[PDB]
Amino acid sequence: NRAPTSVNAQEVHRWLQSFNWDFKNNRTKYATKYKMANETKEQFKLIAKEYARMEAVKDERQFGSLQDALTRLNAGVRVHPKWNETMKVVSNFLEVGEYNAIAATGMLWDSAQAAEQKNGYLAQVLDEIRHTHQCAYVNYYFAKNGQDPAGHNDARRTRTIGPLWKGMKRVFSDGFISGDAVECSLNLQLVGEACFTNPLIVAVTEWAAANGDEITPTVFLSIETDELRHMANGYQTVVSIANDPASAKYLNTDLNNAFWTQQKYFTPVLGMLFEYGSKFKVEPWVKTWNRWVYEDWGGIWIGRLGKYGVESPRSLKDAKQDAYWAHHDLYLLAYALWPTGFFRLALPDQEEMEWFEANYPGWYDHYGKIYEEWRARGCEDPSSGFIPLMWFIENNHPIYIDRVSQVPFCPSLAKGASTLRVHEYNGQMHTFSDQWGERMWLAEPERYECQNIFEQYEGRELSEVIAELHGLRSDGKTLIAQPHVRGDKLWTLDDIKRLNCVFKNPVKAF
């Protein structure tokens, strides 16, 4: 006996701000330099039920897409081998990033005092759970239906053999949750998301489509549909701490540290995975990097925060100076260490060499010469008895690991930054690749104690390390990682054992 009536999410969110009540111990449980205001609002007026409905619609579309049309089309098989190998690393590393984003957003939700800011953070927490499961499902699907399951099916335990995993862990695991909650927000939301993760997702969809992959676009566009709320969350954090003198004291320091942290790893790794892990090229990494950092983030996004005192990072000039050759050097080092990965890597072919030379003049005389020498020595042939690390050792080109960033570097052979800093403190020696990480460590040494692969594996034979960490395929002899992407002449653990390659700590020579 009335008009049919219902209450929507907005009419309930209208009264959410009043939910929190004041008592003596109503404060954040974590250490922080900033005081978040308690009148902060959120751009999106969501309740638990409405958020569930929104996410369920997207999930039904993506999973109906994956289980009917993409499966019927063999879309998981008809993908270039190089891109299939690349998606292992990309999907698993994004999965770890989203997982640690869950914990980071939980810490942020603890920090916030306004109920609306808390609601936004909780929505992002559920979203990061969704994104974790989506990336895990990309690996799941490519394992069930892909042309090579190894690495997709056991990435969560084979990630731990290779060196790139430590840097990935720092950027998307420890940089997200370890430190001031505002600093963690800057790493995750203000810098990690606005600068890298979102354009990363879009560009990954572009490159995956170029290489016959339709599973990655299907999952990652659905992932990216959730990013407006997270960008709003980062903006809300910066707004909520903008009225505190602690902001004027510390916010620019935190933002610069977060920017350098993220860029130091996402400059070389992303470009290397794109340009060397793909057959069909979409765009040189230098142009994409310049557009992402100087155009989209450094110019527009950071400019939007000028009213709250946020300044452009002071290390942006250094990042640009070092961003030209970083991924080529990182790929040299990563191919030299192919046995330690959980993916198959391919040497550049003639077409790829010509594309590299066209887009990066001077690339050949250094990188192409090295790669052609490696190929002429049989880096791809198991009977050759050669892994490029042998070439590094013969030519007196040590490979170090940055104590802070965990990124491998070869200062005596790099084209980009070629500075090495070694310090001895309390019976230990630490090697740094730049001034910013060196300052980070000198300022707070106790935060940076991760052992690198050369210390954990010091004095151990490579085959023993690979065997112990389960780096083998189902047959028990063939390695997950290979120096090529063809289906024949795969390297076995006996091939690695015949080399007799024993890990050494490069710093002992000092």
Partner 1 sequence: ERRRGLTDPEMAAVILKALPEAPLDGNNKMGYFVTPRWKRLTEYEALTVYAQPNADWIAGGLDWGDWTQKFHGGRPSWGNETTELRTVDWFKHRDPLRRWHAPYVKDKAEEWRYTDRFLQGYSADGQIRAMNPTWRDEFINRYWGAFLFNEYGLFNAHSQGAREALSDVTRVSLAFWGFDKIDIAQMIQLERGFLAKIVPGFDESTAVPKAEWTNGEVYKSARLAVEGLWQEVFDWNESAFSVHAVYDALFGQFVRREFFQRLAPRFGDNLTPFFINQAQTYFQIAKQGVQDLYYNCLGDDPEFSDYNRTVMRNWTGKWLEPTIAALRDFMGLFAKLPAGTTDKEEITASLYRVVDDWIEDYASRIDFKADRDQIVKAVLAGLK
Partner 2 sequence: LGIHSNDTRDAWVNKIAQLNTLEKAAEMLKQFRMDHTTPFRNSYELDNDYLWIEAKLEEKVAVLKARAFNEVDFRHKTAFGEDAKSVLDGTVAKMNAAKDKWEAEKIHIGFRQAYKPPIMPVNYFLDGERQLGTRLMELRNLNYYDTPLEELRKQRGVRVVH
Binding residues for a copy of itself, rule: CB under 8 A, are: 60-70, 72-73, 75, 214, 217-218
Residue ranges at the known binding site: 98, 128, 131, 193, 227, 230
Contact track, partner 2, 387-426, x by CB under 8 A: ---------------------------------xxxxxxx
Residue 12 or 210: the one with the smaller Cβ distance to a copy of itself is 210
Span 233-292, contacts to partner 2 by CB under 8 A: 246, 249-250, 253-254
Q: What share of the chain is helix, strand, coil (3-state, %, to 5)?
A: 60, 5, 35
CB of 102 to Fe ion, least distance (A): 9
The Cα–Cα gap between 357 and 367 comes to 10
- DSSP structure class, residue 491: P
- ∠ CA 21-232-313, rounded to 5°: 115
The region, left, alpha or beta by phi > 0 then psi within -120 to 50, assigned to residue 313 is beta
Span 454-473, contacts to partner 2 by CB under 8 A: 455-457, 459-460, 464-465, 468-469
Active-site residue identified among 135, 379, 410, 501: 135
Residue 241 or 465: the one with the smaller Cβ distance to partner 2 is 465
Q: Which does 438 bind (CB under 5 to 8 A by kind): partner 2, Fe ion, a copy of itself, none?
A: partner 2
Q: Which does 428 bind (CB under 5 to 8 A by kind): partner 1, partner 2, a copy of itself, none?
A: partner 2
Output the six-digit token pair for 190: 């203000």
Q: Which of 42, 95, 98, 434 binds Fe ion (CB under 5 A)?
A: 98
Q: Which does 468 bind (CB under 5 to 8 A by kind): a copy of itself, Fe ion, partner 2, none?
A: partner 2
Q: Provide the b/e sequence for 253-287 (b: ≥16 CB within 10 Å).
A: ebbbbbbbbbbbbbbbbbbbbbbbbbbebbebbbe
Show the beta-strand stretches assigned E in 53-191: none
First to last CA, the chain: 88
Contact track, partner 2, 178-217, x by CB under 8 A: --x-------------------------------------
Residue 73 or 442: the one with the smaller Cβ distance to a copy of itself is 73
Residue ranges at the known binding site for Fe cation: 98, 128, 131, 193, 227, 230
Helices first, then strands: H and E counts in the chain = 26, 4
Count of residues in contact with partner 2, rule CB under 8 A: 43
Strands 421-425 and 428-432: antiparallel
The Cα–Cα gap between 92 and 368 comes to 29
Q: Which does 157 bind (CB under 5 to 8 A by kind): partner 2, a copy of itself, partner 1, none?
A: partner 1
Q: Which of 359, 41, 88 is nearest to 215 (CA)?
A: 88
Partnered with residue 461 across adjacent β-strands are 502
Q: Which does 375 bind (CB under 5 to 8 A by kind): a copy of itself, partner 2, partner 1, none?
A: none
CB of 306 to partner 2, least distance (A): 20
Span 105-134, contacts to Fe ion by CB under 5 A: 128, 131
Output the six-digit token pair for 239: 């707004």
HEC assignment per residue over 439-490 = HHHHHCHHHCCCCCHHHHCCCCEHHHHHHHCCCECCCCCEECCECCCCCCCC
CB of 200 to Fe ion, least distance (A): 11
**Residue 11 identity (one-letter amino acid):** E
Residue 80 or 327: the one with the smaller Cβ distance to a copy of itself is 80
- Backbone φ and ψ for 502, nearest 5 degrees, come out as -105, 130
Residue 308 near residue 238 (C-beta atoms within 8 A): yes
Residue 29 or 72: the one with the smaller Cβ distance to a copy of itself is 72
- Indicate if 135 belongs to the active site: yes
Residues that bind partner 2 (CB under 8 A): 28-33, 180, 246, 249-250, 253-254, 314, 420-429, 435, 438-439, 442-446, 449, 451, 455-457, 459-460, 464-465, 468-469, 510
Active site residues: 135
Residues that bind Fe ion (CB under 5 A): 98, 128, 131, 230
